[PDB]
From a paper:
β2m is 99 residues in length (10.8 kDa) and has a seven-stranded β-sandwich immunoglobulin fold that is stabilized by a single disulphide bond linking Cys25 and Cys80 (31, 32). The protein forms the noncovalently bound light chain of the major histocompatibility complex class 1 (MHC 1) and is important for antigen presentation. Another example is β2m, in which aggregation of the wild-type (WT) protein is associated with the deposition of amyloid fibrils in the joints of patients undergoing long-term renal dialysis (dialysis-related amyloidosis [DRA]).
To examine the structural effect of other amino acid substitutions at this site, the crystal structures of seven variants (D76E-, D76A-, [name]-, D76G-, D76Q-, D76Y-, and D76K-β2m) were determined at high resolution (1.15 to 1.52 Å). Comparison of the crystal structures of D76E-, D76A-, [name]-, D76G-, D76Q-, D76Y-, and D76K-β2m with those of WT- and D76N-β2m revealed no substantial differences that could explain their different stabilities and aggregation propensities (RMSD < 0.6 Å over all heavy atoms). For D76N-β2m, the network of hydrogen bonds involving the sidechains of N42, T73, and Y78 found in the CD and EF loops of WT-β2m is maintained in the variant. Interestingly, saturation mutagenesis of residue 76 showed that these six substitutions are among those that have the least effect on the in vivo growth score and on protein stability compared with Asp76.
Numbering used by the authors: 0 to 97
């Protein structure tokens, strides 16, 4: 058996075809087992309609998840990614560094 703690990155990207669009991304990488819970948060509340959840693996024991959706950030709100995994004794909340 092997278990590996996810690395968690939270960032925004504008698709080059539409600069008015902005995506909030949680990139959860290098984890095992594949069991996981990932949410995007706005002001600590789970964002319910996340448009994209892309799972892959490299080696049989390394998984990668890109979890992302359209958003319109303001100065008045806080955005984050929350991850639960067996390797994490408490939920890990990673704030967006703008």
């Amino acid at each position: 058996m092997i278990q590996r703690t996810p690395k968690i990155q939270v960032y925004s990207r504008h698709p080059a075809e539409n600069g008015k669009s902005n995506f909030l991304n949680c990139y959860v990488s290098g984890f095992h087992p594949s069991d996981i819970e990932v949410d995007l948060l706005k002001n600590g509340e789970r964002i319910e309609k996340v448009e994209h959840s892309d799972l892959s693996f490299s080696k049989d024991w390394s998984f990668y998840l890109l979890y992302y959706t359209e958003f319109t950030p303001t100065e008045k709100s806080e955005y984050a990614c929350r991850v639960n995994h067996v390797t994490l004794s408490q939920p890990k909340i990673v704030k967006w560094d703008r």
